[PDB]
Design a protein around this nucleic acid. Structure first.
Ligand SMILES: [Cl-]
Length: 892
RNA sequence: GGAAAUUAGGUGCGCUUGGCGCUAUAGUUCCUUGAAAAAGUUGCUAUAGUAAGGGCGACCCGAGGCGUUGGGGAUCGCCUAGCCCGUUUUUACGGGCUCUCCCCAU
DNA sequence: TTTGGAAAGCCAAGCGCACCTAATTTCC
DNA sequence: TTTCCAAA
């Protein structure tokens, strides 16, 4: 009952092997699969929703004020007022308001318009992009041409003669926030000179306060919550790198670890030399190894350990190149401290440097910085948090230090650094200073080992988190079947930049109980190179190769690697784990394992071992979450219905993105109402070689009736057909579908029917109730009634079994096409992982267990059998006998 | 393999802003089709919508991940969960306890 | 029905933290 | 990657 576990872990799969190294037999093998980054669309959607909401609120706050300050009676009045007929362009009104009184209506439009877009405001703390160049250029245009305001620039300047708003993803019209504030103030001023009653200084101040309001990049404890904890004191936060304690610790560690070598040997610096290097670092901006040699007058027989001196030993060049210490944060803060006069007694102390470091590292807005440095910061639970100096600093200082930017933390808390530094000051190495302070420098886990792996610390990297948690489920399933392993051999694929390898090794080593044995490393990391050589040499050379690799990994120890090097040394003047190992591996990876094992000489497996023997069945992780993108993003117009009941949609499309045929024709909506534009585009496309980028890299004009040049043509509406759309914005647009949540399967008079359920259906009161009819519009799909029996719901990667009726077979297609005369396999029946449904055809798509074959467009209506199964972690599956059609109810 | 530091990078997660794109409507503009009624096209500007939908004014949630169980999953719960006890490994170690629902298994 | 495949919202300008790599050092 | 269209 002792075994070796082999594990092959990627970001999308865990191959595994149970091997008995004494019996010299493969016990059991398998594969668990779990197929931008995952959170990015969600994060971006979050940002978009907030931006739009905050803009709307700003306009709403302004409209509420306009009532209260007496520009209108109420909001109902205000809306009607402004939704009267606009005569003059609001940009022209913005310019007119500089030299004449604006009417109430004109003024209201101007104030709303100014609040739509607030311009660029840098948050930079440390090449210039297209936004910065345009902001700078626009600022220069206004300064040099004497434009009184942004609007005056935008109306009068040649740069904006064709458009004011930005087009085709350029940033020509982006201006500074400050220039728009100048405009607001100017217009309130000029309106007051021209006797506008609604331009009072009170109104001005409330307008600017509303217009200017914005949230800081971080508020309160937000940064503190992201900062990690001390390696030694895990309820402490990590210290800022800008703190004195961090910088002095780092300095002392560095100097104490210097080593110098001559022909005789290697030595450290003495206490006298250290003091000299330490004092130089505290006064000089940067220190090189050259400055270290110079301050100590160190003989040219000595070299510093760790430098590359090459052949020539051009010592000044090598040593001058290498900066050993640069206490930037210290010197920057020390300069600001020296601008601030102190009383005769007191001096700037370590706690002042730490306090300012904390303030600027843990907080980014001026309100939090100010409160903290005034010693009255309240955290997000209203609890006072005094600064480290317990000091209310002066407004002068707070103002001055807020010009600095600090960031980043070390691994250790301030408390830990306070205890360690005194021992580093006595010249100890880092490790011994830690010991002297009362800390185990390795922070070794004191925790008790466990029979199954405990839950994993949830980490923010969703791909790494999935891999580790799936690998845990595999290991724990295998422990619960076979008991504890003697060792675990692990290989990883490089897909997480080393995070999975480092995490997983340490986690298993620290937490898992191994079966009692003499073997030293409980966790053995094998190289892909060695694995790859053995597979080639053994001629063992899809999802099954992960299982193969898990076998090789399991039987790869260091003692076996020696036998390969012994062989290659001997051959210079091939090792197998056991007899028939190749043939056994091939047997265990095959569909007919029993037949292949029994074909080996001399009852290679016992009668028991053969009775237990199943073919490998790859286990695929279920995906049964009902959240997801609700529908596609772009809004479309419905312009008609096809004969077969599809929606005809249209959407404005840039000339470069239009789809043209051989003749340069395209599906332009309203072609009949614009032959000049239709013909101009087609003609332009044909002039060039159907090179769309070349053709549409210059302006195209619509010809006027007289034949001279009229307006530019940048896009037209293109028509396309779609069965299923959803209305948005009170039916003012439609949108297409995104991923299907689940497919509900029904039976009626021995035929099968499919009802796709979309994310938009989760908001409804009732489930959708129409099963697909191929090539017909939604109106002609069939309403479900008592004649249909509900069978089950299929999510992606649910397991199905189908049997085709006798008149035909299912054509499985090889995922990887080959030199074979046959790249398809036709089967009467199949167990397969469901992928989805084609709503135009009621035909499905699936993959066989290991992903090596698939089918697509398989109609279900006249199958002989259609059943649902479910798979466990290790590959066993179980028939679903009965399901209820579940309602769908998000908490949102 | 493990701790800390440095230099140069990488991946991910979170946040604040800016500007578009698309849709709808109004004006203006290029007009086109149509006997007419009408319908619609090009450019510019404005105003509105921009997950679907839900909860209470620098309002909030809403496309991600994980937990579970006899074995699995979630629309449930959580996102660095909660709540106790033991212990001088008291910033640690140990041991208790725990929502609703669906499928499978005995 | 099966097969082949087009389309899908996007970029600029920053503020942060976590984890990981390569090289270098002192250490268990 | 996924929906689902039009071609085969
Ligand atoms: Cl532009």
């Amino acid at each position: 009952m002792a075994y070796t576990m082999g594990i092959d872990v990627g970001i999308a799969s865990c191959g595994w092997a149970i091997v008995d190294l004494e019996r010299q037999r493969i016990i059991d093998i398998g594969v668990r699969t779990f197929e931008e980054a995952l959170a990015v669309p969600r994060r971006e959607a979050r940002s978009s929703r907030r931006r739009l909401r905050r803009k709307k609120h700003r306009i709403e706050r302004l409209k509420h004020m306009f009532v209260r300050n007496g520009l209108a009676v109420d909001i109902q009045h205000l809306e009607q007022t402004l939704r009267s007929q606009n005569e003059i362009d609001v940009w022209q009104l913005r310019v007119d308001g500089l030299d004449r009184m604006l009417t109430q209506k004109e003024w209201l439009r101007v104030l709303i318009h100014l609040a739509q877009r607030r311009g660029f405001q840098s948050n930079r703390k440390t090449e210039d992009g297209q936004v910065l160049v345009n902001v700078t250029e626009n600022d220069r245009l206004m300064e040099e041409k004497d434009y009184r305001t942004v609007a005056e620039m935008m109306v009068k300047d040649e740069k904006f003669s064709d458009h004011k708003r930005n087009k085709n993803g350029n940033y020509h019209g982006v201006v500074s926030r400050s220039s728009l504030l100048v405009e607001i103030h100017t217009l309130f001023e000029t309106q007051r000179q021209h006797h506008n009653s609604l331009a009072s200084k009170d109104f001005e101040l409330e307008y600017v306060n509303i217009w200017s309001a914005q949230r800081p990049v971080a508020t309160k404890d937000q940064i503190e919550k992201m900062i990690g904890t001390c390696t030694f004191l895990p309820k402490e936060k990590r210290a800022p790198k800008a703190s004195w304690h961090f910088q002095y610790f780092m300095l002392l560690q560095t100097i104490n670890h210097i080593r110098i070598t001559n022909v005789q040997g290697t030595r450290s610096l003495n206490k006298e030399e250290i003091e000299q290097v330490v004092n130089m670092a505290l006064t000089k901006s940067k220190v090189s190894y050259h400055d270290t040699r110079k301050i100590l007058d160190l003989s040219e027989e000595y070299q510093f350990v760790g430098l590359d001196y090459g052949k020539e030993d051009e010592k000044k060049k090598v040593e001058s190149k290498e900066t050993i210490i640069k206490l930037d944060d210290y010197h920057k803060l020390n300069k600001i401290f020296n601008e601030v006069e102190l009383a005769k007694g007191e001096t700037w102390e370590a706690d002042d440097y730490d306090t300012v470091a904390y303030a600027l590292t843990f907080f980014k807005d001026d309100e939090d910085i100010r409160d903290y440095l005034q010693n009255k910061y309240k955290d997000s639970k209203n609890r006072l948090v005094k600064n480290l100096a317990n000091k209310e600093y002066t407004n002068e200082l707070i103002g001055k230090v807020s010009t600095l930017s600090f960031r980043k933390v070390g691994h250790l808390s301030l408390k830990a650094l306070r205890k360690i530094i005194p021992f580093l000051e006595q010249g100890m190495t880092y490790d011994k200073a830690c010991q002297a302070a009362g800390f185990d420098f390795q922070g070794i886990s004191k925790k008790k080992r466990s029979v199954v792996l405990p839950v994993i610390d949830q980490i923010s990297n969703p791909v790494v988190n999935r891999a580790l948690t799936q690998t845990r489920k595999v290991i724990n399933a295998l422990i619960k079947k076979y008991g504890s392993p003697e060792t675990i051999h692990i290989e990883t694929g490089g897909g997480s930049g080393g995070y999975i390898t480092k995490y997983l090794s340490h986690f298993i080593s620290t937490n898992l109980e191994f079966s009692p044995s003499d073997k030293k490393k409980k966790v053995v990391n094998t190289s892909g190179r060695i694995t790859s050589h053995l597979r080639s040499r053994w001629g063992l050379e899809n999802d099954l190769h992960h299982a193969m690799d898990a076998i090789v990994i399991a039987v790869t120890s260091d003692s076996f690697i020696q036998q390969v090097t012994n062989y290659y040394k001997r051959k210079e003047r091939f090792p197998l784990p056991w007899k028939f190992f190749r043939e056994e591996v091939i047997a265990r990876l095959s569909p007919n394992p029993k037949e292949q094992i029994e074909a080996l000489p001399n009852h290679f497996y016992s009668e028991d071992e053969l009775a237990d023997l199943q073919p490998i069945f790859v286990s695929r992780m279920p995906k049964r979450s009902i959240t997801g993108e609700a529908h596609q993003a772009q809004f479309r117009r419905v312009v008609g219905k096809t004969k077969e009941g599809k929606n005809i949609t249209a959407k404005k499309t840039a000339l470069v993105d239009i789809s043209y045929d051989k003749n340069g024709d395209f599906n332009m909506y309203g072609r009949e109402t614009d032959p000049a534009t239709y013909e101009a585009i087609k003609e332009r496309y044909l002039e060039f070689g159907g090179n769309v980028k070349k053709a549409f890299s210059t302006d195209l004009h619509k010809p006027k009736k007289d034949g001279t040049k009229g307006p530019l043509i940048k896009s037209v509406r293109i028509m396309e057909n779609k069965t299923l759309v959803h209305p948005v914005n009170k039916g003012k647009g439609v949108v297409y579908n995104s991923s299907i949540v689940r497919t509900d399967v029904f039976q009626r008079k021995e035929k099968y029917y499919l009802l796709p359920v979309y994310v938009t259906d989760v908001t409804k009161g009732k489930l959708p109730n129409k099963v697909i009819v191929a090539k017909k519009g939604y109106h002609d799909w069939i309403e479900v009634d008592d004649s249909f029996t509900f069978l089950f719901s299929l999510y992606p990667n649910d397991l199905i079994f189908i049997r085709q009726n006798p008149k035909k077979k299912i054509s499985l297609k090889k995922r990887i096409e080959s030199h074979s005369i046959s790249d398809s396999k036709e089967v009467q029946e199949i167990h397969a992982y469901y992928k989805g449904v084609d709503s135009s055809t009621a035909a499905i798509e699936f993959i066989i267990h290991d992903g090596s074959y698939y089918a697509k467009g398989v109609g279900v209506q006249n199958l002989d059998c259609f059943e649902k199964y479910q798979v466990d972690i290790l590959g066993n599956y179980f028939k679903v006998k009965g399901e209820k059609r579940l309602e769908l109810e998000t908490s949102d």
